[PDB]
Prior knowledge:
The structure is a homodimer. By secondary structure, the first copy, chain A, is mostly helical. Chain A has one domain. In chain A, 95% of the residues lie in helices and 0% in strands. The longest helix of chain A has 54 residues, at 2-55. The termini of chain A are far apart. Chain A binds chain B through residues 5, 8-9, 11-12, 15-16, 18-19, 22-23, 25-26, 29-30, 32-33, 36-37, 39-40, 43-44, 46-47, 50-51, 53-54, 57, and chain B through 1, 4-5, 8-9, 11-12, 15-16, 18-19, 22-23, 25-26, 29-30, 32-33, 36-37, 39-40, 43-44, 46-47, 50-51, 53-54. The PDB classes it as protein binding. The entry lists the keywords Leucine zipper, axonal transport, protein binding. It forms a dimeric assembly. The entry is titled "Crystallographic structure of the LZII fragment (anti-parallel orientation) from JIP3". Chains A, B: C-Jun-amino-terminal kinase-interacting protein 3.
Amino acid sequence: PEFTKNALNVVKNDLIAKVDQLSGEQEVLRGELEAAKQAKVKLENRIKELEEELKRV
Amino acid sequence: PEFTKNALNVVKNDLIAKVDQLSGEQEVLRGELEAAKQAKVKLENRIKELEEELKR
């Protein structure tokens, strides 16, 4: 009864902590993913600039 | 002239190489995101089951 409730709360809170840890990892990864996406746009625009410059000899 | 063309291509090819590396990083990152998302879903279902058991 008291032991059971206690035990259930202990494991429940363990799992909640694991979820929060994953959420933290997610936020970091999403940040890296956004940074990569923006950096790629810049590079691709620069490649188009260089292709124009090559055309102009 | 030809020296100019070669020089610009060095820069162009380097940028292309960098784009490819970022494409690789994006794919790895997306794979890790999906794994995390799926892991979270499983944890949340386990938490829900425990919450329902606590109600009893």
